[PDB]
Amino acid sequence: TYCVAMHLADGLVFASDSRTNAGIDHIATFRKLFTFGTPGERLLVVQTAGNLATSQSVINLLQQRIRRDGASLLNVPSVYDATALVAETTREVMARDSGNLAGNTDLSCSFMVGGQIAGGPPALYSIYPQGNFIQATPDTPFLQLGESKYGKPILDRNLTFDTPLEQALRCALVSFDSTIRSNLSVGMPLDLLVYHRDSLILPEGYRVTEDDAYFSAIRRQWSAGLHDMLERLPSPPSAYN
Amino acid sequence: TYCVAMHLADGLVFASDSRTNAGIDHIATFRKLFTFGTPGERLLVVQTAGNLATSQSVINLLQQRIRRDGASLLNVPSVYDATALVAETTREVMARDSGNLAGNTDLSCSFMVGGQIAGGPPALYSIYPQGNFIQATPDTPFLQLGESKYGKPILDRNLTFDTPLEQALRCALVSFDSTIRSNLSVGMPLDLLVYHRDSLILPEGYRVTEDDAYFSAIRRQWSAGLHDMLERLPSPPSAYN
Amino acid sequence: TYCVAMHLADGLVFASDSRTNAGIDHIATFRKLFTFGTPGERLLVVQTAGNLATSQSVINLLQQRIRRDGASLLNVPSVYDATALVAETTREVMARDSGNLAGNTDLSCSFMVGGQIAGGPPALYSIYPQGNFIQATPDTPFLQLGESKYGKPILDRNLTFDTPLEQALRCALVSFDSTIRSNLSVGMPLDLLVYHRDSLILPEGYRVTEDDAYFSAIRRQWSAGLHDMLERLPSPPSAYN
Amino acid sequence: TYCVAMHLADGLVFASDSRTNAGIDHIATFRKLFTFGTPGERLLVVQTAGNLATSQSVINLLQQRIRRDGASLLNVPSVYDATALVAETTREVMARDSGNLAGNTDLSCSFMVGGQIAGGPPALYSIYPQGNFIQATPDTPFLQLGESKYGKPILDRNLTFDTPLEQALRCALVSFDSTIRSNLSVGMPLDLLVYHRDSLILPEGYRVTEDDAYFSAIRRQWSAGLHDMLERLPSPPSAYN
Amino acid sequence: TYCVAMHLADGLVFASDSRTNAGIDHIATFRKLFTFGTPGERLLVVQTAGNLATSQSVINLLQQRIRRDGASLLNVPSVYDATALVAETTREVMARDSGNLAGNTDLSCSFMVGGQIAGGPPALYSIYPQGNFIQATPDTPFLQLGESKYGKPILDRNLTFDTPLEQALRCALVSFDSTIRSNLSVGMPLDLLVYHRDSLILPEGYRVTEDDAYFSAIRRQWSAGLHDMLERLPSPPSAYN
Amino acid sequence: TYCVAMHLADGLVFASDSRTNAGIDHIATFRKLFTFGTPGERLLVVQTAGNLATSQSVINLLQQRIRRDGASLLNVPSVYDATALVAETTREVMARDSGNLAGNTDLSCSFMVGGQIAGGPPALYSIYPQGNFIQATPDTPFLQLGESKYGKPILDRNLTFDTPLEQALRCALVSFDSTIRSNLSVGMPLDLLVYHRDSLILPEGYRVTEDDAYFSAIRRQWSAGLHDMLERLPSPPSAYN
Amino acid sequence: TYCVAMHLADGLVFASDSRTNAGIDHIATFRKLFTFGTPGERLLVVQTAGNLATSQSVINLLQQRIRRDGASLLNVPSVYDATALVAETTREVMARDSGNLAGNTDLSCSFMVGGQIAGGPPALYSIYPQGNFIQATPDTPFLQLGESKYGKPILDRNLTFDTPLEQALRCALVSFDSTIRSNLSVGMPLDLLVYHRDSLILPEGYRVTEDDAYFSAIRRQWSAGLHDMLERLPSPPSAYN
Amino acid sequence: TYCVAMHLADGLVFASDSRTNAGIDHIATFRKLFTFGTPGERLLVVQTAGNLATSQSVINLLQQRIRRDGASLLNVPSVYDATALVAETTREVMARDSGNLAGNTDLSCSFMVGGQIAGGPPALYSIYPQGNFIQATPDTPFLQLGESKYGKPILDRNLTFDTPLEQALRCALVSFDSTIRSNLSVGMPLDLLVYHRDSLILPEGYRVTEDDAYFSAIRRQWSAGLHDMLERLPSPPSAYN
């Protein structure tokens, strides 16, 4: 479980893995990036991390309620209020499943909610386990969920609000490369989605499998590159021994 | 707090940061790499991570006991037994400080113990919070303590049992570069030590400050390198949008 | 005790064994697949694993309550809510039988709940011992209960959301074949049920006995096949000795 | 962690994975198959599963003690007594590391010990977590450690005391194939060793990596085979719906 | 103490011995089969096994409470709920007699509860020492309490859901014959009751004494039969010596 | 696990199953009947039941010690002393494997030891979990180990000191028939041995597999016989309803 | 200490000795049969055996509490509940006197509680040292406390539910005769009470002393009778020598 | 288990039952009266009670040692010394079987040793569980083992040193009658032996089975007699109600 989202000058980029702890000796693939919207009016993306049961219930309720007269991700007036609604829904799920039977088992999960509603700029929020949230800004234009330390440095180094979408996406992919190599809890397939500021369309998004030609290639290249740079770095002076 | 140690064909390489959480609003510099030994007979290095009070007490008792007739890091017959002694000492410290007054505060810490005693190969162990330990091997030739996910990938990618010492050290430094950029809890100065297999001398080791010419240079180079490789990676195919 | 359920493009497939630990020196046959519904409106299937007393009580209450004005598997508005109801009922049963008299004996059990209610797609959930549940998806389209590691690989290898029902069923049967050979706790007769997406009928389902001509045949074939493939695999090179 | 050993008419075959849980967020490669002996006099193989710290300590002490006047794997008069010595050593390690500091953490591990000493037949034992052990026989000629249910069926189906070594090894590899696909805690490289009855030599053994041409090939073949056989199985009769 | 109960297509059959361990050097006769009901409305039978004191208290309270406005075996809406009530009552009794004074003495007992209440089919449950219970089904149509292994085989071999009552009873009697011969803790008189599906009458039931003409006769016949069959079985081939 | 041994006027008969609990989810085949002796001088048979590890170790030590100058099953002056030696050996094995590591796991096992040594009559003993033993006599001429209640009645009914060997063996086989049908922990193959009083030869003994023509036949006959006798028994009189 | 009670068709009969171990070298007379009740409403009898201090304290508290608003032997709704109250009281007494000071001394005692309360049949219970109790029934119509084996046979032989009260009493007296002759811990005076079913009066009861004309007479007669019968029995045949 | 022995003016009489607790759910027949001697020189009888394993071992060793140059029941100079030897042998057996493996299980047993050695009068001893013994005398001419309270009164009443043998034997038989009726742990067949003072022959002794004409007859008579005497006893006076 590792998710990244970026809010940049030209729009939004989202990327999630799929490897999921679904119980003991049951590790499995589950989509962690979900889209919602009405074409020409709004796009909203939700990413998930943490307890599967909880996050599934949250997503499921959001879907059921879309087709119902009352508060829903389709009628909510701002990305902020969408984020609040997701949190609100999370609280509701935690209230029901909590009891003596759950015991000490850890039901918490976290989310990212981003997108654009007609008449206001695109936005991106992250909701924490405890249900309070923060918003990405130009100074801090990307947010992560899950097992994210491994792939943070490459984003810190290169990403900024002005990074174009194609490059941000590339950058995200390198993030996943390192993460996947160093931590088995994170794993393919990946799910990506790029959204263009003011387009107000629902992009189809794209899934990166084990076989993906492009992703295989940039991984091979990135390895060769790092190995090269390392050998061509200078030796430490006398002093260091 | 981030420490790395490597046990390679040609010897051992150790590196630690110094930034330490010593209470609220009191972040400070403390050495996390300590050496012990008698020239021509043995070298032992201990690195620390976790609770400052605990680790300090452990190190302090190991030093006091060196100058005393009984079990000590200078008479212990093997690196294994040295590791065991450190652990033994840790248990002793935890027993004394534990009480109602400590309450729920977290007194645990972890260590690495590596080196060489005359008449057997060099070795490297890591002691866990709970006092049990593991040994580095050719298949898993480096071990980390502290805040280590950020700088793990570069080691996973490039380091192997056969990597020479000068290159392993270099590799470690890049590990610290990324870590420092992405996590404030980790910070300079760094303390390094390189030990040559069968030398049985106590290297002086070296401290890398903010001002270090060499470290500044390889950071600047590494940045330029990464930035280059990133721009010269190919674009995603049509399919990805 | 081994149960499998699959949620595929064309519908649902369920399969359970019947061998049951009913106490010490009392191993016995009990159905572990139960159906509910009203023709033209809904089909729901519940499978059971774990403590017999507990699961029986749960099923029994669900049956009694069907014929009663209030929450029941026949009036519940979605497969989700059905799953929730089963869980709710489980909690109720655990509460009552728990006491000093039970002592340390393990009263937990698990369930699968799947089916289709008029006006929404078919769905499949698995409820864990602790009462929280997950939903099968296209990326993870089958779920297991009980003693399931033995027969997992064949499903992992061949089954996907798009697998047709007849082939999924066949696949399940091979899963049971391996399981039965390698673990005595699992045993015949088996109980199967196939449901076609949007049919909204209650299939009669089918019981596979010791004598079943078809199942005997595919077991014999599958053996011969495996034995053949193994002999016709190449020899390991020189290197391997 | 998955290990298999077979004691057959023509000798012994051993195979182990290397993926090891070494702490939280620290999964790593460690050899789990170790050899000992004097050429023309004896071969002994020890495989490990369970807690890394414990098993490492046991192996380490056995190695140190080989080079010492007293009970050791090189002077022990029978494979039985070797097994007993390993167990004896395990007890010793558990006694020392046990204390308040370990707490509720699970230090147990299991071993296989097999081989041949001059003047008696080859033998194979498995030591349980609790320190008691069993011997493989003609009726039960293979033994497993670790995560073994996934790959048990293929061994149950095909393996017997009279299976030749080359075919037993092949069989083991298919066992690992299924296991690796269905459980991420098991992983390459693998380590194999084949020993010929009465040879009294120390085979070098062989390591199967990710890249291995032969293993890659039989995996590809085995997949194609299974897929074929599945499509060419008959359809269930009318009765089954 | 040995009890059997069967739930068959045509109704229920119950049979119990009477020999009871009432303390040290005090073995005695106590009825272990009790009936309750209102003619034309319900029949319930309770059988007992285990601690005399505990089971007596349970039965005694059930009787007292029948003549009292509140939950009782006469008003309870289903055989299920009757079983639950018995269990509920058992818990109550165990709570009271438990203390330091009882010490380690074993107060547990088990029950069978079967019968029919107007408007639903007949049913049969068995309650375990720990208070949870199971229901007999067509696949497992008989249940035993007490010292039951001796007489199990004849029931396993011959009894099924479709066995008529007169034959099931006969079968039960042969079960008791073997048991009584092979285990002194079981002993006559026996108590039988046969109930016809949908009759809703309280059969008087019947006691089999030492002197019973019919039971004496079938025992004599059964012996002669077994002895005959044994002598007329063929001799083992050469091979067997 | 079910073993029987008989000491009759004409000699000894031994029979054991092979199904063995070797751990959780690991049920397997292991021989439970072992022979020892020198032709023309002695025959001794040992049967085992209970913990596999313990019984294997006992048997293994007895074998090793046979080929060694000191107390052994070949030099022991009487069947009594043989039994004592087996017990003695058992104590030795329990002493070693006992420790904190075993914990509460149950290491006990039981044995039968029977045979004949030149110059004295044949004899048969049974050793209990606690190491004390009894001897079979004319009044109690058979002894059982393991899961024996199921097949006791047929032996109680028919077997006496004067039963000839061929008929005793036949009787034993029927005992196994019933046991196997009613308890899964008991299972084929079976191992038999018949020894003729004063022959002083080592019979080869015989193994009964699943496929055995004779055993299959008498099982089929015995079923038919029982079914016949049951239908031809009279009906219970009026009185019984 | 020897007490008997019988529950017969026509009522109840109680009889107790009086010899009591009250400490070392202090054997003494204490009544062991106590009556309670309100004429025309209820009769309850309590007999005691075991530790004097304990039983006295129990009786004493029951008496004090009779004259107090709350649970007492006079308001309790059934003989069952009376028995439960006695047991309850016993627990209370054992709780208080238990401590380090008592040490290993044995404070346990047993009771019989029998009688009749208006509106339900007469009943008789026996409470065990541990506080659980049993009820006498038609099949087991008498119960004993204390040193009872000596006088059990005459009761087993002649007493049944239908035995009239005058004959039962006579039978009890012979029981005491044998007991007194064969065991010095039992001794006169005796205390009797006979109660007629449905009389609901408090009989005065009667004390049998050393001097009692009737008891002396039947003892003398019984001796003469036994001596006669013995001489007029036939001689053993030739065979017996 | 119930044994009696008498030492009278005219000789000795011994009688034992045979019912034996041989383990849980294994009650069986074993001889508890054993004879030894050389005609014209000595007769010794040993009776056993208590733990089967222990008493069997004792008897077995006494038999083996008879045929050996050293202390044995045939060379021992007095009945006293014979008794001492038995005790001595018991100690030896307890020493060997005692260990951690026996645990808390109760290995004790008791014996009677009686008979006559040329040149001194006949004698009779009883050995207690703790190995010290007593001798029967004219004032206390009979001794019992096992479950003996039931049949003590008839012996106390009628037996004296001067009772002739035929009458003492008869008396013993009545003792067994009552015991058997009132306690199931005691049971037939019985074993008797009568020895005539100064005869110095080994009587064959006699076994009383279920079918014995004489014993059946005196039981029937004794019942009728007791029943008669009881009905012919006078009624209690007015006073007693």
Numbering used by the authors:
A (entry chain G), B (entry chain H), C (entry chain I), D (entry chain J), E (entry chain K), F (entry chain L), ...: 1 to 241
Could you give the paper's own sentences about this structure?
For experimental characterization, we recombinantly expressed the Anbu-1 protein from the pathogenic bacterium Pseudomonas aeruginosa (Pa-Anbu) in Escherichia coli. Crystallization trials yielded a monoclinic crystal form with large cell dimensions that led us to expect about three to four dozens of subunits per asymmetric unit. Unexpectedly, these 34 subunits in the asymmetric unit constitute the repeating unit of a continuous helix spanning the crystal. Within the helix, the subunits are arranged in 17 dimers of opposing protomers, distributed over two unequal helical turns. Consequently, the intra-dimer interface is virtually invariant and does not exceed 0.4 Å root-mean-square deviation (RMSD) in a superposition of all 17 dimers. This is contrasted by a high degree of variability in the lateral interface between the dimers, enabling the formation of the irregular helix with its two unequal turns that differ in the number of subunits and in the rise per turn: A superposition of all possible pairs of neighboring subunits yields RMSD values of up to 1.6 Å. We initially tried to fit the profile with modeled closed rings of six and seven Anbu dimers with different diameters, but could only obtain reasonable fits when using helical segments of six dimers from the Pa-Anbu crystal structure, clearly indicating that the solution structure is not a closed ring. However, the Pa-Anbu S1 pockets superimpose exceptionally well with those in the proteasome, revealing a relatively narrow, amphiphilic S1 pocket, in which F30 and L52 form a hydrophobic patch, whereas the moderately hydrophilic T20, T48, and S55 are oriented for hydrogen bonding to various positions in P1.
